[PDB]
Design a protein around this ligand. Sequence first.
Ligand code: NI
Lengths: 273, 271, 271
Amino acid sequence: ETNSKITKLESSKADKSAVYSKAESKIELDKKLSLTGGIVTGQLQFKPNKSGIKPSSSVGGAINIDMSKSEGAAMVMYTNKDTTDGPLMILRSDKDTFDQSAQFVDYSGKTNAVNIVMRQPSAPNFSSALNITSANEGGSAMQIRGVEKALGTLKITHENPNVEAKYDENAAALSIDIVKKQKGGKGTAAQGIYINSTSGTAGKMLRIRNKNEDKFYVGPDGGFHSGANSTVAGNLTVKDPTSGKHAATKDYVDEKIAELKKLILKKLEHHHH
Amino acid sequence: NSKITKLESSKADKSAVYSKAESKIELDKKLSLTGGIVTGQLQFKPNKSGIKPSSSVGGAINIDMSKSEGAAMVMYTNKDTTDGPLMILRSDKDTFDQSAQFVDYSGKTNAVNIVMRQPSAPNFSSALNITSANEGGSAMQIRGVEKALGTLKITHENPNVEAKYDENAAALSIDIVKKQKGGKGTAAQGIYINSTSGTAGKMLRIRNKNEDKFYVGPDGGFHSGANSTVAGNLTVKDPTSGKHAATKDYVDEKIAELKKLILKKLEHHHH
Amino acid sequence: NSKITKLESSKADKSAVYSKAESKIELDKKLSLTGGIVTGQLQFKPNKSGIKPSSSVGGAINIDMSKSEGAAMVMYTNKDTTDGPLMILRSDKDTFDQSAQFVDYSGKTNAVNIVMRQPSAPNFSSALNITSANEGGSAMQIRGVEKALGTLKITHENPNVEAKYDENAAALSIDIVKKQKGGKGTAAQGIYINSTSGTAGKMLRIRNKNEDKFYVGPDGGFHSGANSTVAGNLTVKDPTSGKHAATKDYVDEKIAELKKLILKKLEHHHH
Ligand code: NI
């Protein structure tokens, strides 16, 4: 009865058929993502349940990338495809009650928080670096606020794309269009540019300069200064003049003519020989 | 007997099989679907993988937050300095016919929010910086349908309590420059305002302290609220009302009229 | 008679190894490189891991769509309300010397597109909101090289069919305000238009129905297309042409000139 041992070896020990070898384990493990990194070739879906995903801008998110301890970018999305069927990155919210932003960038630093560069195409096309559209009539499509000491809150620079001076004659730095409703619109009373100072400013409201020479401005009181010959295709209403170079009114001309007429008729009616 | 042979065949060698503990060691190096911490680079290289453009179910990465609280993704850094931006989107072919980023937003607050915090020391940075080298298209476009607001709203706030501190600031600053390399000039315009369908509103309206100071109407007439100056001549129509500016012709027209009548009285004077 | 000791040693016990079925259970809780569904938080904490800034191969996450259709990543939510934004980029140190986001775009359509859909009810919300507390730099900069378009193009569309519905709207709205906490005023300007190199084009050009109504030329002269008013005096040069506005000096000189001439005719006539 020496086989009271072989039976207990036949029972208590694992059959190769019923267990993975290390070579087979490696095969299986190699199809799984290592925490040290790997290459995913399919779709990675995130569907958090009662997972405790938080809104914190430091430790929150279904994906959280903390670069505090590392050089490099948090995420890079690259494509050299000639054409494709969708954008690289999509953010979408469907419910009208949604009360948060699609994207919030909270930037401290010494350079531009967000940088959008459109490279030069082989052939010009109507594409833009950034395109904004809103169908909400209750709010501005876009808002900008800044606290600049000596610069514009919005700075627009147009550079001539060509060496020849007369190439960009139809270009502008700022182009504004005011249109009626596309489907069935009967017109519009919308304004072009509205400049206001709710608290009141001492500065010029509109100031135009060319080649380091000021050319035209509208002051804080609404008076304008034009730097060259000007034209009104129409009448201009002004105050009566009280100084030599003030424009003369029709009334002023007529009063001075009438005054001289009276004096001369006086002399004529009373002169003798 | 020969029982041993069978057990030498059908039984597992310790050397060729991972133990329970060893298996735990190996499995812990793999990401659990319930979550984990990745310390290396995660690369996505889909290639005939059925990736879709769908703005709901598409993407090599898809994050659906419909049933959950919190952000979809947070990118955070407390590093003092580094060698690259947090997030980069890049497409290299000029024939590429989709956007780098598409925001399709419904909701009650701002779709995209960009905040530049107050730095310890003022610097030249901007919250958003746009450059285009495509001469065939606007660098940026904005379209809106506001009832009673601006499509673009610009607010400049004085950074200082003192009133004259921001005397060189502006809400909108425009520069018009020649080509950097070898440019001979430019004929580009500053501000171009048009209404292709035609509007009844003021083209330009200027106010200060809630009161109208200067405006240009839809017909191109202007209304100025204070004393004004033309460093030059101003051409106007002949006046037909008391406060209309008088032309040189009108002054000369009247002078000649009075001259004629007086000389006629003088030539026919009778004692 | 002692091999049994060698097999008790060299062979794996049932208790100390996982079966094929139990291995499967454990492996099924791990993410396959072929794809899967993550239900918890995935944290990235690289730390001397060789993460690079490269806009092609860098990032703790890298998505290369060169060989695949579809989007790189999609963030979707159908939630009614929530406690934070979908995507957050945050940098905390004021010495941070890289951007939060860099888009390096080549292609034929818009690099970044932001769309706010029509809400059930109008509300005070924007597609894009920009705010800087950095007094040393513009909140926003735009540069373009357009041949025949605006670097910035703003379109306001009437939200309603009725022509006067949008009478209080504008394409561009500018406000100039004092410092909120204790500000005593501001000297900031509204719109500053300049050409540092000098341009031949009109600085301000206003049109209605594609026809010029008002413009300021490169020399600062203006043309108004209709009746206009100055609530004040207008200073001009003395006229040298028929339709030039007449000065007070010119009126007085011509009146005095005729007076003299008439009085000398009267002083010397005889009959
Ligand atoms: Ni006589």
